[PDB]
Amino acid sequence: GMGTDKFNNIKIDKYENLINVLKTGDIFLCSGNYLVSKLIKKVSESMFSHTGIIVKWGEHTLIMESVEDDGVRIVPLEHYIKNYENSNNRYNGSLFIARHELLQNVNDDSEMIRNLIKVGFSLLNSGYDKNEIAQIVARIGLGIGRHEDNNEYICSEFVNECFKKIGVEFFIFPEHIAADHHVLPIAQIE
Amino acid sequence: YFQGMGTDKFNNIKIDKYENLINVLKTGDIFLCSGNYLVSKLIKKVSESMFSHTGIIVKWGEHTLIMESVEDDGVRIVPLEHYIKNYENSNNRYNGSLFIARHELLQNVNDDSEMIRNLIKVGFSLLNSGYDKNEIAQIVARIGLGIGRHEDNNEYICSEFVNECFKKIGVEFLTDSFIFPEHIAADHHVLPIAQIE
Amino acid sequence: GTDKFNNIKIDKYENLINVLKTGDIFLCSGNYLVSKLIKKVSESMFSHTGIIVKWGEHTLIMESVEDDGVRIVPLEHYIKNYENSNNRYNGSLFIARHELLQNVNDDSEMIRNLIKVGFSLLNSGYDKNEIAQIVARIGLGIGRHEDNNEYICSEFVNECFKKIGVEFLFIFPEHIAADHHVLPIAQIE
Amino acid sequence: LYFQGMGTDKFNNIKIDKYENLINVLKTGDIFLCSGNYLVSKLIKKVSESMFSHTGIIVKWGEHTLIMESVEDDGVRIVPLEHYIKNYENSNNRYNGSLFIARHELLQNVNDDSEMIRNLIKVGFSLLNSGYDKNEIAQIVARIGLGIGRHEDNNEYICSEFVNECFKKIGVEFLTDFIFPEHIAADHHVLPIAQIE
Ligand SMILES: N[C@@H](CCCC[NH3+])C(=O)O
Ligand SMILES: N[C@@H](CCCC[NH3+])C(=O)O
Ligand SMILES: N[C@@H](CCCC[NH3+])C(=O)O
Ligand SMILES: N[C@@H](CCCC[NH3+])C(=O)O
Ligand SMILES: [Cl-]
Ligand SMILES: [Cl-]
Ligand SMILES: [Cl-]
Ligand SMILES: [Cl-]
Ligand SMILES: [Cl-]
Ligand SMILES: [Cl-]
Ligand SMILES: [Cl-]
Ligand SMILES: [Cl-]
Ligand SMILES: [Cl-]
């Protein structure tokens, strides 16, 4: 899909260097090799299987996200690099950062960034139960979107709720976020 | 709409009340369901079938159990009563329709035959203590991708489990696709008995 | 008490299969944290109990496992693959038989009703909240509400027998082991 | 009242503030304390002879107030404090118990983006998990009842063990001669701020 090309020749930065460039609200994107990742890639015809939102606590970099075999969580980006989901190894796939055009000239303690984070925090849960994981992965394969205030989210549905509730509009897969004319690539992580 | 031979085979089958069927059921009978759960629909879509689930009936005396892999749960054995009155701790009937069939080879075989003993042995040997979150995701993903179980692993789609049990007593199912419930329903040796009212 | 099982004959699992009868009482002395909490609060070597159910020649154990659920599974799991570990249950294992069911055949009405009640309580796993509640009740020594379907192992074994008339003298495995009508058969080698 | 320790009197006549008013007074690092009526809460209260069953660390994201904690039937999580007031663990109701705020003496004259506060938060974040499994919940509650601390470099934490790891890694030790909420409440450097109305 047209998000493919947009990231194909983006600069490759080492993780240590990128820390200083990342801003709260930046959009994390991944192309994973996990079975669930592959289902997302097939149904959406994309190289992108995951998305989430970056949140800086001081100098510390966290990723706020819905991970479909896990939950709506907030965790250190370092996990994707060094210990993905208790494997003690790097995420199996490639990793990218982008930034939304509207938030590029907005400081980390702006009103907008505050409300974006607020909404994400409000959706943090304590893991999905077995039933819900099954339901979420099934909706991906069926291409079906979710009920009004049902709280089970595909990664991109979660990124979408947060931006929705600050006005930025984008079913919805990671591809739709990557392909969006207002989403600007920053880097692939080496 | 968009469905196969298994479907017609069960379309005008006699409707029995659960209480009446109990006496007709025999260990090795094949349970079949057409569910409305998201995972049930994914199964129905990818396999182009009304059937989302299958399992093997086991009679302990007068009591009727169902041995099965339930993809959001585990490889378990539980009372058939659950599907009628209390499906997965919901206190309500399974959201879908229910059917019973019998394999031709086991129709003239008594419940303590050596075949039925081996069928039950294998099923018992695969019961687990639930699938972990990772495994449930992987199973449901395979369904959507139409990939069979490609390492020597113990994660089973409902029909895969039923198939392993029968495989290990010499009954093979035309598993052309991988194997979904449809291939069990559609199999020439599988005869319909009833829909449960 | 404890002593009742101390010098009981040690049988190999393969040999015991033929001796077991539906309704036999399974007993364990485990080294798991939850096992030890049961052993402490009840001052006993017994951490677990359950009811044996024979499907033809095959041997199942019907039980409430406090970090899992009210389930029925092959006894073979306790010997070879306890709770997806691919190893034997970390502890020792015993069989007893209740005096009343010794002269009663496997398809008697009593055995039928014992199995009926146990089947009626099988669930699809305990939720996280319920496990915590069960383990907390063990440590607090509190029994359960008559509505509540959350069971300490021994509370489950007790309900089954209660509904066929057999009463046991809150309730931990120790009370079942110690009961004058529960006779030891074997420790599993 | 005689079945209980020094931690208790320290919080008995503390001012009662409405939640809305306390938001402005709270600072990252402040210690949350609860006296719950849940079964697990009672086991904690008995074994530790305390009115306190829970503890956690407050973390401010701008004006929004979060609580970072290990909840023993759930996980090492970070969630809005508002949940304790309006929707505790999906019940849509307030936490069943009483709630308190305290502040450590060392952090009273330290601003919210200090280097210390940064490291406290770093450690907490590093321990956030995706829920405890059924096995671990059982193990944790068992340890509480057995009064045993965590032997290996093990990641299963009683609430106060979590609060203790975060403070330990910025130099603040709590008289842990195992550790329950009581030892945090009773600590001479922990000053009561308010009970939440
Ligand atoms: N959407 C997620 C799926 C996670 C699979 C492994 N936990 C990703 O592609 O990263
Ligand atoms: N194969 C199963 C899927 C599980 C749906 C609910 N747990 C069925 O169609 O019943
Ligand atoms: N009563 C049980 C406790 C659960 C052990 C962990 N699965 C036993 O001693 O075996
Ligand atoms: N430490 C916790 C115990 C578990 C509460 C159950 N939701 C508390 O007292 O709040
Ligand atoms: Cl995978
Ligand atoms: Cl960090
Ligand atoms: Cl991770
Ligand atoms: Cl569903
Ligand atoms: Cl069920
Ligand atoms: Cl343990
Ligand atoms: Cl087991
Ligand atoms: Cl409770
Ligand atoms: Cl909560």
Residue numbers in the entry:
A (entry chain D): 0 to 169, 176 to 195
B (entry chain B): -3 to 173, 176 to 195
C (entry chain A): 2 to 170, 176 to 195
D (entry chain C): -4 to 172, 176 to 195
Article passage:
NlpC/P60 superfamily proteins are ubiquitous papain-like cysteine peptidases or other functionally related enzymes. To provide insights into the function of these biologically important proteins, as well as PPNEs in general, we report the crystal structure of BcPPNE and a comparative structural analysis to other related PPNEs. Our results suggest that BcPPNE and YiiX are likely amidases with specificity for the amide bond between a lipid and an amino acid (or peptide).
The data were indexed in space group P65 and the structure was determined to a resolution of 2.5 Å with four molecules per asymmetric unit (asu) using the SAD method (Rcryst = 19.2/Rfree = 21.9). The final structure of BcPPNE contains four monomers (A, residues 2–195; B, residues −3–195; C residues −4–195; and D, residues 0–195, where residues upstream of 1 are a part of the purification tag), with a lysine bound in each active site, nine chloride ions and 41 waters. Each monomer consists of a layered α/β fold with a central, 6-stranded, antiparallel β-sheet (β1–β6), which is protected by helices on either side (αA and αC on one side, αD, αF and αG the other). Extra, unaccounted-for, electron density was identified at the entrance to the active site of each BcPPNE monomer and was modeled as an L-lysine based on shape and electrostatic complementarity. The lysine occupies the S1′ subsite and forms a hydrogen-bond network with several conserved protein residues (Ser48, His49, Glu67, Asp68, Tyr83, and Tyr90). One striking feature of the active site pocket of BcPPNE is that the tight fit of the binding cavity around the bound lysine at S1′ renders the catalytic cysteine inaccessible to solvent, suggesting induced-fit binding. Side chains of Glu67 and Asp68 interact with the free main-chain amine group and the side-chain Nζ of the lysine, respectively. In this conformation, Glu67 occupies the position expected for Tyr127, based on comparison with other NlpC/P60 structures. As a result, the bound lysine seems to have induced the rearrangement of a short loop (residues 66–69), containing Glu67 and Asp68, which, in turn has displaced Tyr127 from its (expected) original location. Thus, we conclude that the ternary complex of BcPPNE may represent a “closed” (or inhibited) conformation of the enzyme.
